[PDB]
Design a protein around this nucleic acid. Structure first.
Ligand SMILES: [Mg+2]
Lengths: 414, 409
RNA sequence: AAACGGCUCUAAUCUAUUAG
DNA sequence: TAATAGATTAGAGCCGTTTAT
């Protein structure tokens, strides 16, 4: 009648069959193909080939040369060809150069090639269709697009699925109530490194900015005693984070910057007591667990250290405190490599190449689980990490990262 | 729990007025938006390079598949896609045998300059060769594609192990797709455009390139290069910003016969108040001028809790009315895979200056991620504004440039 | 330099403070 | 001038080629 039938090797010849079928439908041809239907079928096939088909096409590839469905469709199409007495009812479509001469099906061989080019093959098929009286409609690529969207992208859309996401950001549960600027005029040596103090401390002006109480640095700074705490400037941390406190002594943005520096220094100092190893990144310190420091190199069923060929990978983390959306700790994930699990590889090129090799097969689930397992490994209590900013002051980092949810998602590939 | 918003995936128009979301799929189905009828290739290189390019041309005439043909659409063949012939029989070859090598290739090109695009085949046997070659070809307006010999014949170049140095076995079809799209775009044919382009919105990519002291470069996207070296700050002087915005507005007025109703300036740097007042003092009153700063690798990583696949592309975290995170990368449902490896980095988009709806800004940026004509990919990590601005800026800093992007990409 | 990402590394600048 | 931060920024390499079949 008017239909155009294409028979093909369904599992492997889908690319050419899809291209040809949608191209022909874009040209106005009434194409019938097994790939143009959803939730399909041999009675319908045989019926379309027997009565509806005007021209019957077969992708003559090596894989499709001897296939049960292809051969069955070829047989019924040969029956219809004998019934209609059309010399060119069945048109082989030679697309595979691997299919050698005298190796194609006996019926096919004595009967257009796409091996050299698909455009040349499509043009030959088109001119054959014009030489015979193959019915066609005016070129309507709109319906080709519609069929492509309706069938080939039917299971490949964004659906109305409620999806939940874990983030890089672990909320800061609480801060010490007061940020204190201690006026260690001479008791703090001018050349003393405040980074070497027991608790995070920033020299700010004529003061030491810290969450620590004024006599917390007694051991490191013996002269800290006999210092009056009245001259210390005490600022509510909530005032700093809410932007309420703006004073000539220290700008609000500078106060938040000092708070973030204290957070970063407190995290750095806490990793010292967290039985974890450190690795100097370009701009920060990543923190990784040695081999043998975890039971079977696992924490709560998540492998944080493993083997890469003759090397050992360790899931490391680096944390930067931030306060803009909410007080959080952004934890970047890294893979840090060691020769035997304890001894770092000195060369950064080998470290980077190994990081790429290990992150090859690391995906959303792996990165998420490793980040969460490492953060829970640094947990002090059930749901928080303690950063000792002072003897009686702590910064609490949430064990659980910030949670997100969207009303759109996808069906996961299987 | 923060609510995520989803930006609907933009469609891109192709031939016969057909819109889809994948440049590869749309090109294979409907054909290129602009139909050129042939690509005459000019080859500059050695005899080995000419043979490599000819072999790759014969190969790309035939269909080429990827390892994953569902995740990465395979290449049907150049003529089967673009409806025109790009063959090795239509090749004019200039036989060969950093500044002197650039001069060699440049002279071999301009002496002959009727080709559509000149293909510079680079022998493997110079970190500024491409940019300089591209820059001194600007005044003679040659569309050029530089192809390393280890790209067209990536198998033939191996390490001491014997494995290929550049492993393109899994992305051979994607490599053919990208090379075909680059050659077609440089030959004068736009393969797609935005399916929906808001009328009267002008898109500007404003980047700064460190000349080896920083050169500001603006590229206007028509759905337009600008350059000026200056001191070591990523900001524009009053007169410099005024000249930039005036040139962009006049280019838009020439193209569309009217001034834009909105102008969006995309940058990787925040705008200071001085340069923004300079921008505002030259824009028309009815034109809304918005300064959008897009930063990459800001340490946020949304991990899909349930599955092994990442956050879907198009999800956006609206931090503020002016600040947000946009996942221009991530899982693509149509591709059934991710545009990125491991977990995607969202781009942080801030409305630093001006007033605009943040959702509309992220929609525009997601749309502009589709116009990367330098690559035949589903979508880009960053909008074509910033990407093409960076390309033409690094190209210009190598030392009036042409306004067509095919002379830079 | 087909290209895009993920990473790593190196710098520069602006702030705020301090030592000159 | 130098140092300590936090923030922004850019530039160079380098590796993999996006979990299925
Ligand atoms: Mg290019």
């Amino acid at each position: 009648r008017n239909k155009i039938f294409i028979s093909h090797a369904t599992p492997e010849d889908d690319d050419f069959t899809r291209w040809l079928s949608l191209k022909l439908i874009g040209l106005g041809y009434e194409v019938w193909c097994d790939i143009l239907f959803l939730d399909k079928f041999w009675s319908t096939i045989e019926k379309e080939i027997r009565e509806n088909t005007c021209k019957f096409l077969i992708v003559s590839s090596t894989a499709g040369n001897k296939r049960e469905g292809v051969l069955k469709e070829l047989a019924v199409a040969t029956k219809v060809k004998k019934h209609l007495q059309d010399d060119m009812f069945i048109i082989p479509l030679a697309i595979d150069e691997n299919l050698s001469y005298d190796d194609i099906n006996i019926e096919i061989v004595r009967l257009i090639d796409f091996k050299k080019s698909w455009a040349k093959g499509l043009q030959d098929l088109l001119d054959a269709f014009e030489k015979q009286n193959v019915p066609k409609k005016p070129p309507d690529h709109s319906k080709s697009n519609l069929l492509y969207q309706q069938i080939f992208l039917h299971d490949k859309q964004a659906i109305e699925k409620e999806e939940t996401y874990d983030s890089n950001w672990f909320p800061i549960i609480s801060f010490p109530n007061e940020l204190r600027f201690h006026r260690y005029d001479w008791r703090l040596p001018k050349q003393f490194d405040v980074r070497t103090l027991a608790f995070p401390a920033i020299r700010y002006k004529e003061y030491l900015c810290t969450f620590a109480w004024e006599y917390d640095f007694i051991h490191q700074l013996p002269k800290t005693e006999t210092y009056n705490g009245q001259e210390s400037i005490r600022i509510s941390t909530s005032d700093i984070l809410s932007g309420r406190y703006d004073t000539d002594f220290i700008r609000n943005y500078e106060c938040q910057r000092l708070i973030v520096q204290l957070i970063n220094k407190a995290f750095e100092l806490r990793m010292k007591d967290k039985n974890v190893r450190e690795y100097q990144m370009s701009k920060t310190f990543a923190y990784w667990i040695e081999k043998g420091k975890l039971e079977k190199d696992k924490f709560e069923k998540i492998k944080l250290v493993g083997k890469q060929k003759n090397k050992y990978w360790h899931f490391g983390i680096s944390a930067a405190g931030k306060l803009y959306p909410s007080p959080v700790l952004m934890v970047s994930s890294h893979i840090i490599f060691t020769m035997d699990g304890i001894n770092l590889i000195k060369s950064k090129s080998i470290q980077h190449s190994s990081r790429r090799k290990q992150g090859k097969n690391w995906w959303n689930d792996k990165w998420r689980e490793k980040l969460l397992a490492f953060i829970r490994f640094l947990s002090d209590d059930q749901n928080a990490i303690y950063l000792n900013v002072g003897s009686e002051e702590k910064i609490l980092i949430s064990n659980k990262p910030l949670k997100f949810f969207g009303k759109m998602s996808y069906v996961t590939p299987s | 729990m923060k609510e995520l918003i989803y930006i609907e995936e933009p469609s891109i128009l192709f031939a016969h007025g057909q819109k889809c979301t994948d440049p590869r799929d749309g090109l294979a189905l409907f054909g290129p938006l602009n139909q050129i009828y042939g690509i005459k290739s000019g080859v500059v290189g050695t005899q080995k390079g000419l043979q490599i390019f000819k072999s790759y041309l014969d190969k790309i005439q035939k269909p080429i598949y990827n390892h994953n043909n569902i995740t990465r659409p395979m290449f049907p063949g150049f003529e089967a896609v673009f409806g025109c012939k790009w063959e090795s029989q239509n090749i004019v070859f200039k036989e060969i045998t950093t500044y002197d090598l650039v001069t060699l290739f440049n002279d071999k090109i301009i002496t002959a300059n009727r080709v559509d695009v000149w293909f510079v085949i680079v022998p493997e046997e110079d970190a500024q060769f491409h940019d300089q070659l591209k820059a001194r070809l600007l005044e003679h307006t040659i569309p050029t594609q530089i192809l390393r010999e280890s790209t067209l014949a990536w198998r033939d170049f191996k390490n001491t192990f014997g494995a290929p140095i550049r492993d393109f076995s899994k992305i051979e079809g994607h490599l053919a797709w990208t090379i075909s799209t680059a050659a077609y775009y440089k030959a004068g044919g736009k393969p797609w455009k935005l399916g929906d382009i808001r009328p009267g919105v002008c898109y500007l990519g404003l980047v700064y390139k460190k000349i080896e002291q920083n050169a500001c470069c603006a590229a206007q996207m028509f759905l337009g290069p600008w350059y000026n070296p200056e001191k070591g700050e990523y900001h524009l002087k009053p007169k410099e910003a005024k000249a930039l915005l005036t040139q962009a507005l006049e280019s838009y007025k020439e193209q569309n016969k009217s001034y834009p109703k909105e102008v969006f300036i995309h940058a990787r740097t925040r705008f200071n108040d001085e340069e923004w007042n300079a921008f505002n003092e030259v824009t028309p009153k009815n034109t809304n001028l918005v300064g959008v700063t897009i930063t990459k690798s800001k340490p946020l990583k949304l991990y899909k809790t349930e599955g092994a696949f990442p956050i879907m592309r198009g999800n956006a975290y609206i931090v503020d009315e002016k600040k947000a995170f946009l996942w221009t990368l991530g899982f693509v449902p149509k591709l059934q895979s991710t545009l990125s490896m491991e977990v995607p980095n969202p781009i942080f988009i801030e409305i630093n200056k001006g007033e605009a709806e943040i959702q509309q800004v992220l929609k525009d940026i997601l749309a502009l991620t589709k116009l990367n004509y330098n690559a035949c990919i589903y979508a880009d990590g960053e909008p074509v504004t910033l990407r093409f601005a960076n390309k033409i800026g690094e190209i210009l800093t190598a030392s009036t440039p042409p306004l067509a992007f095919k002379y830079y990409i």
